[PDB]
Structures are given as structure tokens and as C-alpha cells.
């Protein structure tokens, strides 16, 4: 009785370099380096280092996504005099032409973050997000609570739902009736510009999706003390997931199922669920029967890994 | 002898009569044992500890005992035995049995457990956390008569793990997950119960050494090709159910290869197997059943062919005899539009014949021979019975006219010469 | 021959679900018949099922839900504070919470359910809590959708319920009045675990062979040979592996084997694989052409991985 080399003591140490090289090649789309030489033999620009430092500290599209930083307006224009910073933390909108220059189309844009300054924090407060739909009236989107801290730390926001249609903000406090603050743009480069289970139930595919399965507590499992529910679809997922760079399908539907693919880290291509739904279970025991609430039971969307 | 089973008031009852022989203790929540009241009589040989979790061991309290014969541990949670004592016990080396069921043995625990005592026999590891087996862990275990490797997840095995071991008749490492086994270094094995395990190829080496293992099990295995055995002819039974083979030794007499993808069968696979006695090839996607070999089934005592969608089966236009003998001819979920004429008019040894879901349309030429009927059914026969009286001069005992939907008319004409001779009758 | 592997996967999946449930109840096989009558379901159980079926608008341990209700308006309610023009209040006895959830730390999750007439073009919701006798406490703010089918909203109130259980106050409540610019009572669900279902009633630092992650550091200088990337020089490209053993479902079970399964199989997959779940991005920079560019690559950093 003996086994093979299986994963092998030498193979576990090797091939990760090749796997990560292939992953970077596929994500960057560049099969070969762009060019050799013809580069400035000097220190990197300070703006690039500042952007990297801003995006490095702590607060999905498979293709690589470009990040862009927009500088805050210096609060020197015609309408500055209207807002005198009285009982309201003034904020200003940005220049539309440079937004258009950074992001050519809204579809390419995916998400964005906006950051403030946060220094003293003497009293427990709460920071309101506002949106400038009209010059006279505004709406409410979300609220953020801040914990005291001497060292300032940048915080993000949820402008991803509003910057998409901005093709043409304030700061206040709740009232009882009884570095410059830049905004981050993770757009998409123009060069690299091109899940419900019934979708792949209707059309049969050899890729990794969800296949139909039925479970009933009559004879498939062999017991009967579960009274409710009698029947539900406890589906599964299975499929021979291939390598993304070897096949080179380049399809919108195919590329949407590779948000968790990582052969180098996983060391084996497999399918793993990412989002599930809860399931209540009813059974009888003791004087008064009780009901249990089981979460993370039924798989809904399953991708590769 | 006498014993108390199920009574618990303290750690040691201290009331057993002297020169006792039997001692069984279950559902006894023991706390701690000592080596000052453990030896009231040095004549104990049989003991059992089940549902008897205990950890505080006195580092070999059996040294004062006259002898130890049998040992078994049940529902004992040995988790930090490394600093409790060396191994688990050091008694008189005359051990016969030793069970470690439900103790969660680890690599270090297994290394410490097995010591320089070659008389350890009947060692069981059912329900324990074994990951790997090394060469230095089996030292001092030259015999290891009986093996129980249930519920053990052995995924890596060192080349030649079983070295210097002969009494290896039994080996049941069921409910394991080992990828591949391609080398069989064992020199004396009898039964191999590899079942409910995930195997991915079978490439066992061969040679001039005739292996004497009489049982090979490969159930619930995800193979891809037929697991060819070495050239030895010492084997009596084989199980290959719940397997996947893609088709793209004379002592053997038992076959069980159901739930497969049999599409084309080679002539040699049936020619190189003399003297068979059993077969099981049902619920398989078989379509071609051409018969050209002299004895392609040979001799059988049972046949199960349920859930088979083969088109038609024929012996040969001019075959010299069809089958030597046959007892069971079970088959179900078939689409046999035609009826083979030579299948039945060959021998009178047929006992059980049931055409369930067969749609038999036998010609009404006037069955006649093989007047030794003991079981028969006409489920889903298609065409309705037979215009004249069938089964002439044949003693039929069991009849099942379920789901016939044929020519009945309530006359009961076929049930004329078979009514007085009946054992059990049922119909839909 | 395409119906054989499909049935194999069907039986493997149902076996996995059976094993998951048999480990999930953390006990032996219960008697289905027992002594309970086989009569019609009582109103309480169907009410619980209706409350837990509608969609909303340590974590693997058994979570049990209980039902508590408010008291109809009366002198005691209209004694401390009243309603001038518009006010919606829901408050519940602390003794009811104590008899529902015995230990404050034992509580895990809490949800608040509300009924809305669902006939209004515009509406905004504010949540308030009675932190003291004459002061309130700020809570989360959400939005609403002008729908036409009434349904029950869900709110995250785990912290406030934890605080109320930890406090010995006689009576407290919420507050929901309005947006001020300058037989079908609301339900309650408390997720907890019975005392008899408790167990007492990381791997990176140690050396374990399970599905855990350890260190790796590779740069772009020697082992990779990419001289066109100036920064970063290197990063922690951690990886993890794990056999993920499979438990076959049996009728009998032991005690420690429950946690053994809970560590070897948290999702009961047919073919479990030790794969990452939480991923963190990292950006890189390189110079091409005449303009600088920075791109942030996702699915790079791994923290913990499990097979489910
Ligand atoms: C938003 O960004 C755009 C793009 O940078 C700004 O447009 C730029 O505006 C400046 C003046 O503020 C233009 O400079 C002027 O150009 C004319 C061209 O004839 C020249 O005669 C003037 O002497 C002066 O240099 C600049 O050309 C123009 N850029 C482009 C591409 O047209 C815009 O001003 C920004 N918005 C605000 C409110 O600043
Ligand atoms: C039950 O078994 C344990 C074995 O762990 C016994 O403990 C051992 O007891 C002996 C004495 O009978 C100890 O030997 C003594 O060693 C000291 C030096 O440490 C020496 O000065 C004394 O003259 C004597 O030889 C032995 O060390 C000890 N083992 C240990 C502590 O690990 C225990 O006595 C047994 N109980 C009985 C017999 O009731
Ligand atoms: C069981 O007890 C025995 C006996 O005390 C012990 O095993 C002994 O282990 C030593 C050290 O490995 C062996 O000594 C070696 O002998 C060879 C003979 O050629 C020599 O070349 C080496 O340099 C070394 O000195 C000794 O032979 C061995 N004895 C026996 C009977 O195996 C040990 O304490 C326990 N475990 C085992 C596995 O024996
Ligand atoms: C090889 O190992 C397998 C599994 O490890 C053994 O299978 C065992 O088969 C017996 C019957 O042949 C099973 O007993 C059954 O128990 C159920 C109740 O659970 C009862 O309803 C049935 O009528 C039957 O008595 C047994 O559960 C099953 N598994 C084990 C662990 O014993 C097999 O016997 C071994 N030897 C071979 C295949 O030669
Ligand atoms: C020929 O072989 C087939 C299968 O190899 C035999 O069919 C089997 O028939 C028995 C009795 O009708 C079935 O048992 C039944 O099980 C169900 C639960 O599934 C239970 O509710 C019934 O009361 C009954 O016990 C068995 O399932 C069935 N096998 C399959 C695979 O469906 C057939 O009986 C054999 N023919 C002869 C003449 O022996
Ligand atoms: C809830 O609290 C109100 C007070 O606002 C109280 O009237 C309700 O009933 C009380 O609790 C008793 C149960 O222990 C109940 O039997 C009795 O009617 C009443 N007790 C007193 C002293 O008034 C409370 N309901 C509960 C606790 O279920
Ligand atoms: C980005 O951050 C890095 C490190 O956080 C900065 O590098 C430091 O620069 C200061 C000068 O201000 C030096 O005194 C330190 O020795 C540098 N540290 C390291 C590790 O190099 C860098 O200057 C920042 N870039 C910008 C544009 O501010
Ligand atoms: C909700 O209650 C209604 C009223 O009896 C009932 O018909 C329905 O089945 C319930 N829904 C459940 C139990 O999921």
C-alpha cells in the first residue's frame, strides 16, 4: 500500500511563479512587456507617489482598472461668496471638463470614493452625506459615524451611485426640531474596453454554473421529523472550469464568472459558492417545539476559484 | 462469572468478587483511576470501557496485575496524552486485542502509542484523526494480525509503509480519501475492503509473485479505465459497483460491476475468465450485446440486468449450444421489440424467468421445455397473453400478472392448468 | 450515459446535506413520532414561519428565534410621554426579553419588523432610541420605495438589544416620528442559542495541516525577473492548501466529532476545495508611452480561506 507523488514536495514549492506570471499576464492583457529602455533614468514623479500613498492606506471587474485622482477645488470662484461657512460645512462641486477627460463614458466607470479631513474628534458626532441635485433642495443618501482618534485617517463614501449619471455635495449636521479633500476615480482605460440559476437552467452550458436538484424528506434522505418545509430546491454547482488565458474566450457572459478565480493561491481550480440564502427548519422535540433559523444553506451563485 | 453493567456510584465499586473473569461497564461517567485500588485480584483478563470518558491515567497502573488479555476503549477523549504518560499503558507483553475507537489519535499520539511490543494484535483505529502513516511509527509491530482503519483520512503514504509485516489477512481502511494506490508491497493479504473512497487511478504492479488475496473491493471509486489485476489466479470475489469506466485469473467467480458506462465489451475480457459463478451488470447504458465467444458468460448462477436499454440480443445463427446453465435471469426497464428464439430452447436448467418491462412479443407458433418453473412474471409484456393455452406440461408455481393491460376478457384461459399448483400469487 | 454521473452527483449532494443536518442538530437521531399529537399546526408555529419566510427590506452555531409582542395602548403607555400630532412608538417589556433570552451575552442577532400601509408617494424613516429619561440616541437611516404590495421591513438592532439585556431598566422603547427639515402589530425576532445546545454547559501562528494560510514573499528582482516595475518591489502573495476531509453521514454520532465536522466541513460541498473567500486588492505602477498610469489589481491579498 503506497500512494503517488500526489501534489509532490517539490511541486508545491514550484510553479507558483508561473501561475502568478500567467495571472498578471491575463489581467494586464499584455502578453509581453511593452518596451525595453527609453525610460527616464531618474526618480519617479511626485504625483504618482502621492497618488499611491493616498490609495494605499486602509479606510468586481476581472480586467485591470485604472485609478485616477481629482484635485479638490481651491474654493476660489464666483459662487464661493454665497456659502460663508456658518452652521454648515461648505463643500464644492468639481470641474465637469476634467471629469469627462478622466472618464470618457459612464459605462467604463465603476465606483468612486470621496475623502474629507478629520482631526479633533472631541465629541461623539455623525457626518451627513448630501447630494446636490438642485441649488435649492437636496436629498439624503447615507450617514457615517466616526470614533475618536488623534491620528487622522481618510474615510470613503458611496458616490458610486451618483457619479455615474453626472454628465452635464454639502456637509451639514442634524438639527433637532424638539492634503486637499480629493475624490478618487477608479475608471477603466479605453484600450481595455469591450447570478440567477434559471439563466443557466434555460440554456445548458459546460461551464461552472448551477444544476437542478430536488430534495424531499420522504425517501431521498430517509427521515421524517422535519415537518416544514416538505420540499425545497437544494441545488448544487459543478463544472470543469478551464484556464482563462489558455482558452481566450473573451465573452461578456463568460468573463463575469471569474471574479473568484485564482489558481496560484488555491493551487487547484475548483468551484466555490459566494452568496447563499437562509433556510428555516421546523422540528418537534420537548414540551414546546422550537424553530431554528439556518443561514448560508442554499447556494444561489457559484463561480470558479 | 458475574459482573455489574450500567451501575455507577463512584470511581471504583470496590465490591467485585475475587477471582472474577467477566467485567463490562457501559454508561459509566468515570472521572479518575488510581493504582492503589485497581488491583484487588490479579486474575482479570476481560474488560470493556464504553461511554467511559476518562483522562487522568496513573502512568501504567497495570504493572501490578498478573496478566492482561484483552483491551478496548470506547468514547474516551484522548487529546493531550503526550504529557500524561508514555504511550497509554505498559502491561505484560501478552496482549491479544487493543481498540482505539473514538479517541482522535494524532501523528504524535500514534508515534507514542505503538511501541517495542511485537505481540500487539487486533489494533483498531475507528473514528480517529490519522492524516499520514510513516515508517518509524510501525516499528515494534512485526505481526499486526487484525486491522481496522475505519474513518481515517489517509492521503499520503510513505513508499513501503508496511515493511516487515506478514500477518495482514484483513485490511479494511473504509471511509478513507486516498487519491491513488499503484504499488502493493504486501506479501500475505486475504481481503481488501477499499470502499466508499475516492480513487482516481489503479495501476497496481505485477510480477511472478502470485498474490493470494481472495477479495478485492473498489466500490464508490472514480476510476477511468478497467483496473487490471496482476497475473495471479488466486481470487474468488470482486466488487466494482458505483464506479465510472470509460472504454475510449481463473478462480474468479463473483462479479458486481453495476452502475457503469459499458458501451463496448472486449472479447478477451470474457475469454480470459474461466469458471465464473456470479455476475451483476444492471443499470448500465449498454446497447450492443453481440455474442461470438465460445463461452462469453460461461457458467452463471444469477443474472441481474435491470435498467438496460439494449436494442436486441442474439446468440448466433449457428451457435453450438447457448449457455451451459442458468438460474436467475432478472432484467427490467428494457425495450426488446424482438424475441430471441434460441435463448430459451437450449437447456432445462432455467428456474427464474421474469420479463419485467420487456415488451415481449413472442410468436404464437402453436414454453414447452424447461418444465421446472418456480418464478415467473408478465409485467409490461405488451401483446396480450396468447390465443391458445400456454405452458403445456410445465409446473408453474409463482405468477405475477401485474400491469398487463392485454387480452384478458375475464376468461382466465391461461390460468387453467396452473391453478391447482400455486404457492403465492399476486397481481395488479 | 449522461444520466449516470448526474445521478451520482445527486446522491453525493443529498448525502452531504444529510451529513450537514446530522451534525447540525448536534444530537443523536430524534424520534419523529415521540408523543406529540399529529394534529393541525398551532397558530404560533405558522406565525413564526410566516415571519421568517418573507424577504427582508461562532456564526455557524445553532441560532434560535423567539417571538415577542408589544402591549396595546393604555394608560401606562399614555402616562410618561404622549403624541402631539404624529408619533409611532413600539416598546416591549424587559422581563419578556429576559424570559426569551436568558443571558445577555448569549444573544447573537436581533431584527425589528414593522408594518406600513404602503400608500404614500414620498416618505422618509428615522430611527431613535430612548437612551435616558429626557434624551434620545441616534440610529441608522434608510430609504423607502413607493411600492404597492405591503411587506415587513428589517432593521439591525443587535447592539441596542444587547445593551438593554445588559441593563436592568424597568421599561424602555424606541422613537419614530417624522422627517423634520430646518391583530397585525409589529413583530420582533431574537436570534439566540438554548443553554442545553451550548458547548461549555490562529492557525497561522501555530503548525497545523488544515486549510490554513502561511507566509510567502516574492519580489520582481530575482525570482520573477520583471525590471519594468519600479514599485512595489514585493508583496505578500500568501497561499493556502487543505485536504478538506469528507464525513460520511451515519445515524450514531459522538461529542467531539461535532466540532470535528464543524472544522472539516462548514458547507458540506460535494468536492470541497481549500480556496480563498475574502480578497483585497493592491495597485501597481509602471511607465508606458508618454503618460503615467496606475492600475489597482484585485483578488490578490488573501486573509482566510475555507472549503464550503
Ligand atoms: C475645466 O477644465 C477645462 C480643461 O482644462 C478648462 O478649460 C480651459 O480653460 C482655460 C481658461 O480658464 C483655457 O485657457 C485659455 O485658452 C484660450 C484658448 O484660445 C486662450 O486664448 C486663453 O488665453 C487661455 O489660455 C484653456 O484653453 C481651456 N482648456 C481647453 C482644453 O479648452 C476649464 O476652464 C475648467 N473649468 C474651470 C471652471 O476652470
Ligand atoms: C502509581 O504509579 C506512579 C507512577 O508514575 C507511582 O509514582 C512513583 O512512585 C515511586 C514510589 O513508589 C517513585 O519512586 C520514588 O522516587 C524518588 C525520587 O523521585 C525516590 O527518592 C524514592 O525513594 C522512590 O524511589 C516514583 O518517582 C514515582 N513516579 C513519578 C513521581 O513519576 C505511584 O507511586 C503509584 N502509586 C502507588 C504505587 O500507590
Ligand atoms: C524498545 O526497547 C529497545 C531495547 O531497549 C530499544 O530499541 C533499541 O534502540 C537502540 C537505539 O536505536 C538500538 O541500538 C542500536 O543497535 C545497533 C545494532 O547494530 C547499533 O548499530 C546502533 O548504533 C544502536 O546502538 C537497539 O538495538 C534497540 N534494541 C532493540 C531490541 O530493538 C528501544 O528503547 C525501544 N524501541 C525500539 C524500537 O526498539
Ligand atoms: C467492508 O466495509 C463496509 C463498510 O465499512 C461493510 O459494510 C457493512 O455492511 C453491513 C451489511 O453487509 C451493514 O450492516 C447493515 O446495517 C444496517 C443498519 O445500519 C441494516 O439495516 C442492514 O440490514 C445491514 O445489516 C453495515 O452497516 C456496513 N457498514 C459497516 C461499517 O459495517 C462491509 O461489511 C465490509 N466488508 C466487506 C464488504 O466484505
Ligand atoms: C430484479 O432486480 C430489481 C432491481 O435490481 C428488483 O427490483 C427491486 O424490487 C424491490 C421489491 O419490489 C424493491 O424494493 C422496494 O423498495 C421501495 C423503496 O425504494 C419500498 O418502498 C418497497 O416496499 C420495496 O421494498 C427495490 O427497490 C427494487 N430495486 C430497484 C433498484 O428499484 C426486482 O425485484 C428483481 N426481480 C426479481 C424477480 O427478483
Ligand atoms: C408587560 O408590562 C406591563 C406593564 O406595562 C404589564 O402590565 C404586563 O403584565 C404584567 O406581568 C405579569 C406577568 O408576570 C402579568 O401576569 C400581569 O398582568 C402584569 N403584572 C403586573 C404586576 O401588573 C407585562 N407583560 C408580561 C410581563 O408578559
Ligand atoms: C509616500 O510615502 C512614502 C513612505 O510612506 C514616502 O517616503 C518617505 O519620504 C520621506 C520624505 O518626506 C522620507 O523622509 C522617508 O525616508 C521616506 N520613506 C521611505 C520608506 O521611502 C514618500 O515620500 C511619499 N510620497 C509623497 C509624494 O509624499
Ligand atoms: C401564513 O399564514 C397563512 C394564514 O393561515 C397560511 O395560509 C400560510 O400557509 C402561512 N405561511 C406559511 C406557514 O409559510
Numbering used by the authors:
A (entry chain A): 1 to 59, 72 to 180, 188 to 197, 225 to 240, 251 to 361
B (entry chain E): 22 to 269, 309 to 426, 440 to 501
C (entry chain B): 4 to 60, 72 to 196, 224 to 242, 255 to 361
What is the paper's account of this structure, in its own sentences?
TGF-β is synthesized as a latent form (L-TGF-β) containing a 25-kDa N-terminal latency-associated peptide (LAP) and a 12-kDa C-terminal growth factor (mTGF-β) domain. Notably, LAP remains non-covalently associated with mTGF-β after cleavage, which prevents mTGF-β from binding to TGF-β receptors. Integrin αVβ8 activates extracellular L-TGF-β1 to trigger the downstream signaling functions.
Human full-length L-TGF-β1 (i.e., residues 1–361) and LRRC33 ectodomain (i.e., residues 1–631) were co-expressed in Expi293F cells. The best subset of particles could be refined to 4.01-Å resolution. LRRC33 adopts a classic solenoid structure of the leucine-rich repeat (LRR)-containing proteins. The N-terminal region of LAPA inserts into the hydrophobic core of LRRC33 from its convex side, facilitating the formation of the Cys4A-Cys201 bond. In our structure, mTGF-β1B leans onto the lateral surface of LRRC33, resulting in a non-covalent interface of 535 Å2. Trp301 of mTGF-β1B inserts in a groove of LRRC33 between LRR fragments R7 and R8, forming hydrophobic interactions with Phe196 and Tyr217 of LRRC33, as well as hydrogen bond with the main-chain carboxyl group of Tyr217. At the same time, Tyr174 of LRRC33 is embedded into a hydrophobic pocket of mTGF-β1B consisting of Pro298, Ile300, Leu313, and His317. We next sought to determine the functional relevance of such extensive non-covalent interactions in the assembly of L-TGF-β1/LRRC33 complex by introducing mutations to the two key aromatic residues. Both the W301A mutation of L-TGF-β1 and the Y174R mutation of LRRC33 drastically decreased the L-TGF-β1/LRRC33 complex formation and the cell-surface presentation of L-TGF-β1.
